[PDB]
């Protein structure tokens, strides 16, 4: 029942003081967007940067199978918004954080559905 867990391998490489994956495609935008995590068009707000989805996907970048039964990708063809404070490692940010299913913002980075 073997299978390569790349998400864990990258986190272990980051904790080991490794260099984050670079060349993530940062987009030009007004920075007056919704602030939602993954969008069809850049929706960065003043506290965020928008990136090309494919360039921020660990699976797409390492050319390995996606952890989705049909081998489908969430980021490819979309735009992922990353807090300006974490834009130094967008791939690592998408692996560690979760998208709120009711408002669409990142958990603990905009999602306020818990108040």
């Amino acid at each position: 029942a073997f299978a390569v867990d790349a998400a864990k391998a990258y986190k272990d490489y980051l904790a080991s003081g490794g260099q984050p994956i670079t060349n993530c495609v940062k987009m030009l935008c007004t920075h007056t967007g919704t602030g939602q995590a993954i969008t069809v068009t850049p929706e960065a707000n003043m506290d965020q940067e928008s990136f090309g989805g494919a360039s921020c996907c660990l699976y797409c970048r390492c050319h390995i199978d996606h952890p989705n039964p049909k081998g489908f990708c969430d980021l490819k063809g979309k735009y992922v918004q990353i807090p300006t404070t974490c834009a130094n490692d967008p791939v690592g940010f998408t692996l560690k954080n979760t998208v709120c299913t009711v408002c669409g913002m990142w958990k603990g980075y905009g999602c306020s559905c818990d108040q």
């Binding site: 495609v25 030009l28 069809v40 090309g52 989805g53 494919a54 360039s55 063809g77 979309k78």
Partner: protein
């Protein structure tokens, strides 16, 4: 210069009417760098200015618009230009990209391999090409018309570009083709566009706007490339990134341009008039099928 606030500079009409001899390109800006917004790649800035400029033309923009992008990969293994085209094109637009080398894209579909192995049953509304071979830059030989992928691009425009469609093909002092200049005469309007962020490069985008399928003016490719070099040698362009700080009017407006599947014996003068204004696209509206040839040899 009020051109600093433009996304780039188009070749003035008076330079297109000359008969100059091909000379070496010698830019005064050469070696300079534009101040890019923090963390933005050159190709994101470059494609953004190209798109800002295309927003000013009579592009046909139908529903389910079909766009193909050649030379979309990079040494980094990502497709910065494709990400900008995805941001620029209206939702529901089909975006297919291709490159000789493996790369990761935001396109609906990506084909890997020589552009000569790419086949497609259907026609396209817009063709973008950033295909370039650094070998072509040779100052120890004559600067002659180049073939390679240009031969494929010329056949692709003539047989797969929808009437009313437009193209943006990247050229340089040495990466150019005489037949591609000749073909710009088959469009309602054409120009050579230089982005302000790369104004220090002999690079330019030949823009054919609204394909008529027949020659409107007779263009000598050798003479026109000589005219392009003369324009670049005599008109220094101030490097500028000003147009990049205002993205409020960036997205291409969906005009819902009409798509008709007309036969060739029906193209009258009143139809060519609608193609010229960017108010009509002529191609089948069938499903999109693409394929990559695989040469098998053990």
């Amino acid at each position: 210069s009020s051109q600093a606030w433009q996304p780039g500079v188009a070749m003035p009409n008076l330079y297109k009417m000359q008969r100059m001899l091909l000379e070496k390109c010698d830019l005064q800006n050469y070696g300079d760098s534009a101040t890019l917004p923090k963390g933005i790649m050159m190709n994101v800035a470059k494609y953004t200015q190209l798109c800002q400029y295309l927003n000013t033309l009579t592009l046909a923009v139908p529903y389910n618009m079909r766009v193909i992008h050649f030379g979309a990969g990079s040494d980094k293994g990502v497709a910065p230009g494709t990400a900008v085209l995805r941001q620029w094109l209206p939702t529901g637009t089909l975006l297919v990209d291709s490159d000789l080398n493996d790369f990761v894209s935001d396109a609906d579909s990506t084909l890997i391999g020589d552009c000569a192995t790419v086949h497609t049953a259907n026609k396209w509304d817009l063709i973008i090409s950033d295909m370039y071979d650094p070998k072509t830059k040779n100052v120890t030989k004559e600067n002659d018309s180049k073939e390679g992928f240009f031969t494929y691009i010329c056949g692709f425009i003539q047989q797969k570009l929808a009437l009313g469609g437009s193209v943006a093909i990247k050229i340089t002092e040495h990466s150019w083709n005489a037949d591609l200049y000749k073909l710009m005469g088959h469009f309602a309007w054409w120009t050579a566009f230089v982005t302000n962020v790369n104004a220090s490069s002999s690079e330019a985008f030949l823009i054919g706007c609204n394909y008529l399928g027949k020659p409107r003016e007779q263009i000598d490719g050798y003479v026109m490339h000589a005219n392009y070099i003369f324009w670049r040698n005599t008109n220094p362009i101030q490097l500028s990134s000003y147009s990049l700080f205002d993205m409020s009017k960036f997205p291409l407006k969906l005009r819902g341009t009409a798509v008709m599947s007309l036969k060739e014996g029906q193209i009258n003068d009143m139809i060519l008039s609608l193609l010229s204004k960017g108010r009509l696209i002529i191609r089948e509206n069938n499903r999109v099928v693409i394929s990559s040839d695989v040469l098998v040899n053990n």
